[PDB]
Design a protein that fits this description.
Two copies of one chain form a homodimer.
Chain A: H1 7-16, E1 20-23, H2 32-43, E2 47-50, E3 62-65, H3 79-83, H4 93-101, E4 112-113, E5 122-125, E6 152-157, E7 164-167, E8 171-175, E9 178-181, H5 188-199, E10 204-210, H6 214-220, H7 230-238, E11 243-246, E12 253-255, E13 260-274, E14 283-284, E15 290-302, E16 307-310, H8 319-338, E17 343-347, E18 356-361, H9 363-369, H10 373-385, E19 395-399, H11 408-418, E20 425-428, H12 438-441, E21 452-456, E22 470-471, H13 480-493
Parallel strand pairs in A: 1-2, 3-16, 4-11, 18-19, 19-21
Antiparallel strand pairs in A: 2-3, 5-15, 6-7, 6-10, 8-9, 9-15, 10-13, 11-12, 13-15, 17-18, 20-21
Helix pairs in contact in A: 4-8, 6-7
The complex binds hydroxylated prenyl-FMN (2 copies), benzothiophene 2 carboxylic acid (ND8) (2 copies), potassium ion (4 copies) and manganese (II) ion (MN) (2 copies).
């Protein structure tokens, strides 16, 4: 049970890393837990483990906040993510996204069924649990319900049994034995729900597993292709078949060390009030009156001393940014490569509220295409904005070889100086839009359509003969021998650790 | 001779502030001085004073780099600018821009003529100086000449004597007694040059004063209106009439404590090779072959132990950003107010390479206008992009009351989440463009025209009934009593100085 394969092991890894704060005094799930977690995410502090949660009863539950948020140091900024994947805590974004993409051209390693696991240590039936009596957090003061589900994985399977999807989608407590949640196109939970609704025979067999293997929650957050079972993708990525146990009340399979498992159904007919919720872009519209999907809970199984992970999402920086934004970027990089586009790297700048993706271009391959900005912009746009991987992304910024797209400042520099507004852009109004972005859902135009752009920050010679500028910076506007002299004499002259 | 009125006094103030490094060992004006200064600006280190400059002869000259660049601490980030203006070193951007705008509705305090000053301590005639024999810096390795002029003020007067303009415009050594420089529309040095050329009688009487009163170099960098004599604007802003001495060889007047004064003429007929230069947006195009204005130097007068100030401009953060960007923003704020637009604040985000201005909107006044995004966008655009104050700015971002426009992260948040690409924007293709921006001068379209946009990051209800969201952040999504409890218990629980 290594950290990347066992949530309990992961929590011990964060403690050992000095990247955990154990709070053992009573904390209120009504806003206090989430407020502390929000402050953590805004300051890149240590992850909070709430061992003493007002209203925890019969082992349900402790909370771990900020499971995938950032560390303060530059040197191990992404160490929490690295700990999800068995990577060194010093891993770069590139290394993390490469790991997440590694299984894309490997044969799946399907999961291994085991008779039991720690998730079966405790159970509560139909008659023994009430979801309104559990210490479910109120995460933001105007939230329209207590969001039990911010970092567990929904498990649904196609009617024909050939595709089992694992994904994060939010869900809140509706009553003693129901949740309501987001189930929206083009998301795979929605695609599978549609399959069941067209068969029209029954409600969707469903499970929701919290505190799953960290590598599985990463894949849960990533738009891997339609029809690809996350379990086998994680198996290939890690090199280890995941151990799953059967649900007690249906024939779905859950990670054996899951902290907490809900078993039940996702309705093909019923809805209920859902949200509003304080969301990845940084907003809540109090009183929004949306309907969402309705889940019925038949059973709860859980580990002794069960830990619920929780994302207190909103303004920078949390799991919606570090995981949902970055993993969409990774999938867009691959999608571009598979469509023969000379894209080396992609990242969703945090500064853009992960609504942009910067696409680094191999300009030597670009030159060999003998194309133009308008033609290339359109082709990139068509590929990414007509695919599910481009769903959440409203601006693509194309940048040449000199720009590190993992560095927001360099993306903003290139964008601001190399893309002429209007002329160097193409607008896409007949593509699916992401309604959660306030200028979509709460804006001047159609909530679900358009509002997308490809901004070309490639300079004209980058299409023809090659970069025709040097940066007016220390790196490029001074010869190596001089730069090294300045650096060697810096403190001697009177000017002012990598880890620290 | 207070710091804001005397450059020599200002240099002592920086020393006293522990905001100066005196380098007393030999430094090469060929790139070394500028490389050290560039590294300073990229790191917000102390200002370098080069007391020992290879090729300094007969008192010409020492160099002070980064005179208006940033300090490392948040608490006195803008202290170098504050020192230009007699403000406390802790002054905010708002306070600095308010000071710079204060003289806009005050009667000018015209300058006082004095018989002599420290700038007359030494003189070199026609026969005694050679500009190629002075320690003029090579500021970037691909610069097309040694840029003597990066932080002195050009002094030119209208033919009718009614308007004396002070301004920064770059200039490089052309030969023993000529400079070439940028003189471009709509800049006042260009407007006055045009007046002389249409009279057609003589070349423009000219002076270039280096190490002028800090408050005068600030006004030199700011687009105060057409026909307004900077000297009297600085007089009103400071409450003190500036003391000026007459040039020896013409009837122009220079600050009495100027470190170094060039006297001569700006040609109405001749040009010469100018640039390329490592520029405010962060770029140099080596080999650009531009012609520029040609200045003839007839005389040099200077202080004993004369100090030349130098801007090693380029990538963030230097005087082109802190002064030229911010002071244009200030003038745009005022221009908007004078056109009855409900704008409270303006700032040019550094992240935008000071190509954007964020305009904070008083949304209560906006609501009372009973307008729409398209109408308001157009009116704001028309005002700012058809005036000289909007010259350098290619994107206006309109933001409501909740956004601090002095905080780049909050501007980028609002822009990224509240402005729908295309639909919430208006493009302006028939306005003057700033060719120095690489996507203009070196881009796909006309160098001098268009490429401007007003991006509306006001939300729809901000025009009608009022903000209809709360931020999903620590400040807004938790009640005051809880936020204060979290902050009071922060270190007790195990989480981690304003000055530091
Ligand atoms: C990391 C993470 C991702 C998501 C979410 C959150 C986190 C932390 C919440 C805090 C719970 C906020 C919730 O709004 N949320 C969420 C969501 N996708 C939705 O359809 N609906 C959601 O409510 N994603 C994103 C999806 O996880 C990815 O888009 C993924 O690609 C889906 O899997 P699939 O459909 O590709 O299989
Ligand atoms: C602060 C500062 C401003 C400027 C410049 C620099 C600095 C440091 C250089 C480093 C020397 C780079 C030089 O490119 N440069 C510069 C320039 N304006 C130009 O027309 N030409 C220039 O070459 N401005 C801006 C002008 O100073 C302002 O636009 C001002 O408003 C002009 O005065 P006016 O015409 O309004 O009287
Ligand atoms: O509540 C939220 O923050 C989110 C909802 C969704 C829907 C789809 C993709 C990402 C997200 S993030
Ligand atoms: O050389 C440069 O960086 C600059 C040239 C100009 C011209 C006008 C306004 C600002 C600048 S800044
Ligand atoms: K997934
Ligand atoms: K471009
Ligand atoms: K000026
Ligand atoms: K808008
Ligand atoms: Mn999937
Ligand atoms: Mn002027």
């Amino acid at each position: 049970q290594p950290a990347h394969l066992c949530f309990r092991s992961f929590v011990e890894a964060l403690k050992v890393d000095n990247d955990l704060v154990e709070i053992n005094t009573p904390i209120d799930p009504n806003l206090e837990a989430a407020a502390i977690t929000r402050r953590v995410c805004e300051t890149n502090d240590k992850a909070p483990l709430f061992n003493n949660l007002i209203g925890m009863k019969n082992g349900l539950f402790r909370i771990l906040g900020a499971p995938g948020s950032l560390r303060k140091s530059s040197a191990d900024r992404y160490g929490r993510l690295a700990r999800h994947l068995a990577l060194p805590p010093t891993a770069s974004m590139r290394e993390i996204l490469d790991k997440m993409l590694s299984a894309s051209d490997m044969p799946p390693i399907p999961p291994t069924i085991v008779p039991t696991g720690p998730c079966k240590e405790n159970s509560l039936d139909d008659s023994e649990f009430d979801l309104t009596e559990l210490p479910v957090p109120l995460i933001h003061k105007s939230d329209g319900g207590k969001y039990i589900q911010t970092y567990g994985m929904h498990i649904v399977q196609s009617p024909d049994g050939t595709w089992t999807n694992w994904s994060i989608a939010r869900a809140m407590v509706h009553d003693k034995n129901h949740l309501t949640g987001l189930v929206i196109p083009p998301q795979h939970i929605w695609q599978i729900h549609q399959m069941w609704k067209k068969e029209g025979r029954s409600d969707v067999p469903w499970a929701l597993a919290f505190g799953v293997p960290p590598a599985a929650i990463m894949a849960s957050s990533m738009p891997i292709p339609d029809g690809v079972t996350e379990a086998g993708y994680v198996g290939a990525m890690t090199g280890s078949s995941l151990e799953l146990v059967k649900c007690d009340t249906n024939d779905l399979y859950v990670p054996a060390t899951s902290e907490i498992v809900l078993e039940g159904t996702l309705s093909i007919s019923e809805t209920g009030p859902e949200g509003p919720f304080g969301e990845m872009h940084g907003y809540i519209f109090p009183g929004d009156t949306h309907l969402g999907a309705k889940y019925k809970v038949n059973r709860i199984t859980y580990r002794n001393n069960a830990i619920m992970p929780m994302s207190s999402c909103g303004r920078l920086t949390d799991e919606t940014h570090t995981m949902s934004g970055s993993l969409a970027a990774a999938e867009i990089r691959k999608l571009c490569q598979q469509n023969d586009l000379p894209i080396t790297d992609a990242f969703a700048p945090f500064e853009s509220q992960v609504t942009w993706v910067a696409l680094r271009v191999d300009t030597e391959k670009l030159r060999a295409m003998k194309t133009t900005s308008e033609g290339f912009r359109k082709r990139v746009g068509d590929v990414v904005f007509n695919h599910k991987a481009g769903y959440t992304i409203h601006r693509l910024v194309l940048v040449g070889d000199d720009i590190d797209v993992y560095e927001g400042k360099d993306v903003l520099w290139a964008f601001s100086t190399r893309c002429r507004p209007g002329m160097d852009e193409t607008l896409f109004e007949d593509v699916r839009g992401f309604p959660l972005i306030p200028y979509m859902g709460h804006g001047n135009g159609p909530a679900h359509r358009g509002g997308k752009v490809v901004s070309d920050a490639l300079m004209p010679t980058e299409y023809t003969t090659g970069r025709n500028w040097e940066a007016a910076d220390f790196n490029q506007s001074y010869p190596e021998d001089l730069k090294q002299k300045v650096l060697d004499n810096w403190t001697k002259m009177g000017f002012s650790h990598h880890h620290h």
